[PDB]
């Protein structure tokens, strides 16, 4: 009955809701999460191990108040979602990252950077820049498409593996 409680973060404009819902429903979904935090749980098998995957979507990076900090009790690992067309999202993730680190009075946790909307032509993030930013943070860089191409699943498995390897 091993549980993995992993937190998804990112600026507004990405499909944080899509990431979780598509995985747990195994379906192409655009449905948007509510204006407040929303967590989902789904039974999964990872590397031969049967366990529960619990994914939390958060909202309002700065608005992530003590009321929401309650979730930080999970504290396992973080999946950071940005849009290839959304340059500013990188700064919002960084600042949001700094805040959640302060809440945990610590900074050595599993993290993965994931970029959505890679099929969009009109973007302003070069993948060379995005991956270098991930590399400077010492975290994996994965490109994904909410449409069908799932890279988020492996990202969660990476988070789990990093937890297992501490």
Range of helix content? 25-40%
- Describe the strand arrangement of the main beta sheet, using strand numbers: 2-3-1-4-5-6
CATH superfamily: P-loop containing nucleotide triphosphate hydrolases
Count the domains. 1
Number of helices: 5
What's the β-strand tally? 6
How would you characterize the overall build of this protein?
- The PDB classes it as signaling protein.
- Keywords: EC-NMR, northeast structural genomics consortium, nesg, Protein Structure Initiative, PSI-Biology, Structural Genomics, signaling protein.
- The assembly is monomeric.
- The entry is titled "EC-NMR Structure of Human H-RasT35S mutant protein Determined by Combining Evolutionary Couplings (EC) and Sparse NMR Data".
- The protein is an alpha/beta fold and 166 residues long.
- The protein has helices at residues 16-25, 66-69, 89-103, 127-136, 152-165; strands at residues 2-10, 38-46, 49-57, 77-83, 111-116, 141-143.
- The radius of gyration is 15 Å and the shape is globular.
- It starts with a strand and ends with a helix.
Short account of what is shown:
It is classed as signaling protein. With about 170 residues, this protein is of the alpha/beta class. Helix content is about 30%, strand content about 25%.
């Amino acid at each position: 009955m091993t549980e993995y409680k992993l937190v998804v973060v990112g600026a507004g404009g990405v499909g944080k809701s899509a990431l979780t819902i598509q995985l747990i429903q195994n379906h192409f979904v655009d449905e948007y999460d509510p204006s407040i935090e929303d967590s989902y749980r789904k039974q999964v098998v990872i590397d031969g191990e049967t366990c529960l995957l619990d994914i939390l979507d958060t909202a309002g990076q700065e608005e992530y108040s003590a009321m929401r900090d309650q979730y930080m009790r999970t504290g396992e690992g973080f999946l950071c979602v940005f849009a290839i067309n959304n340059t500013k999202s990188f700064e919002d993730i960084h600042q949001y990252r700094e805040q959640i680190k302060r809440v945990k009075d610590s900074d050595d946790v599993p993290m993965v950077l994931v970029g959505n909307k890679c099929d969009l032509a009109a973007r302003t993030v070069e993948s060379r820049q995005a991956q270098d930013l991930a590399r400077s943070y010492g975290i994996p860089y994965i490109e994904t498409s909410a449409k069908t191409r799932q890279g988020v699943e492996d990202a969660f498995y990476t988070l789990v593996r990093e937890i297992r390897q501490h």
